[PDB]
Design a protein around this ligand. Structure first.
Ligand code: OGA
Ligand code: CL
Ligand code: NI
Ligand code: ZN
Lengths: 6, 346
């Protein structure tokens, strides 16, 4: 889905 | 060993024009062995005339970084916050309660970061879709790097926010990024548009497994629950703990107007010195393909970034494709080797 800081 | 120490490069304008070519160059120079490299752009080059017209840029999902831990081992929890503008963020960052403490040298700031990172949780304006470049900037344009990674969008038709599109990060003092490699163990590029510096820690890819073992020793439950729990980007480990357990690492501070490049399977972490803005995305080279094939992915969550390597193996490794589909491709990666495109210089 996407890149995220978590 | 300087062969694995973070290197800094100073390209001319002629050298700066071709991005993938210059990445090949720095690998010919050994830059990938550290897992992290700095690239200082020529002084002529500018990406935005001014950063005063962005005060109405919206930060849709600020995160407050709660940190719990002790003795150099910490876990970071993120709390989503109400959307806010760059203007509001800047005011809270340059605010007295969340501004940089006084300090003389970077070592002192670093000490204060590791001493106080569990207190006074900062706000991190992370993962903002967007770019601060101008449509005319053709060089090192994070929005259009034109590397083979684009095969995911061009041929497979897939778009992954922050991976093949740009992200913006508005930092304040003490905001941090936990130890991680990039999704699918890709490369990343990071430009500090303006503001206070960003400090980085890196572990050489050739020693990444050691870091993983260390982390798995300290968080056995997390390791049991997930195959690659570090990809959760919640684990913070201080340099004193790394030094204590013999994990090689290096550190570097990125200043405004400077690029950082992270390399495949290069673990990195760090923190922001004060109010700043950075733009970042992922990218690839031919060397990355094998990394992508062998990346150990997060098993416990749903919306995780998983790139189908099929298109890459088909196009760039046709002679291995059948074998790879059968599960019998036993290629062993050598982290010291530069990408093939670097043969030009060797
Ligand atoms: O910008 C940040 O907060 C962290 N950046 C990265 O982890 C990267 O560019 O690989
Ligand atoms: Cl645990
Ligand atoms: Ni990263
Ligand atoms: Zn997981």
């Amino acid at each position: 889905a996407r890149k995220s800081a978590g | 060993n300087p062969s694995a120490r973070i290197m800094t490069f100073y390209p001319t304008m002629e050298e700066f024009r071709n991005f993938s070519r210059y990445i090949a160059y720095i690998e010919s120079q050994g830059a990938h062995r550290a897992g992290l490299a700095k690239v200082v752009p020529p002084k002529e080059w500018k990406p935005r005339a001014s950063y005063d017209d962005i005060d109405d840029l919206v930060i849709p999902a600020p995160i407050q970084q709660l940190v719990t831990g002790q003795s150099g081992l910490f876990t970071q929890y993120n709390i989503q916050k109400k959307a806010m503008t760059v203007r509001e963020f800047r005011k809270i960052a340059n605010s007295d309660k969340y501004c940089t403490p006084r300090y003389s040298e970077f070592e002192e700031l670093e000490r204060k970061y590791w001493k106080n990172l569990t207190f006074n949780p900062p706000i991190y304006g992370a993962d903002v879709n967007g770019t601060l470049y101008e449509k005319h900037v053709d060089e090192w344009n994070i929005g259009r790097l034109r590397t083979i990674l684009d095969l995911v969008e061009k041929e497979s038709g897939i778009t992954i926010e922050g991976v093949n599109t740009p992200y913006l990060y508005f930092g304040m003092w003490k905001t941090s990024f936990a130890w991680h490699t990039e999704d699918m163990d890709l490369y990343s590029i990071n430009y500090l548009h303006f503001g206070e510096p960003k400090s980085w820690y890196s572990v050489p890819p050739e020693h990444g497994k050691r870091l993983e073992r260390l982390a798995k020793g300290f968080f056995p439950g997390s390791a049991q629950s997930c195959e690659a729990f570090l990809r959760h980007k919640m684990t913070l480990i201080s340099p004193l703990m790394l030094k204590k357990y013999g994990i090689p690492f290096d550190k570097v501070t990125q200043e405004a107007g400077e690029f950082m490049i992270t390399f495949p399977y290069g673990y990195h972490a760090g923190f922001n010195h004060g109010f700043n803005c950075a733009e970042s995305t992922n990218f690839a080279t031919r060397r990355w393909i094998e990394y992508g094939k062998q990346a150990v992915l997060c098993s416990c969550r749903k919306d995780m970034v998983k790139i189908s390597m099929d298109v890459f193996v088909r196009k760039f490794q046709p002679e291995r494709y059948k074998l790879w589909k059968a599960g019998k491709d036993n290629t062993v990666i050598d982290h010291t080797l530069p990408t093939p495109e670097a043969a030009e210089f060797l």
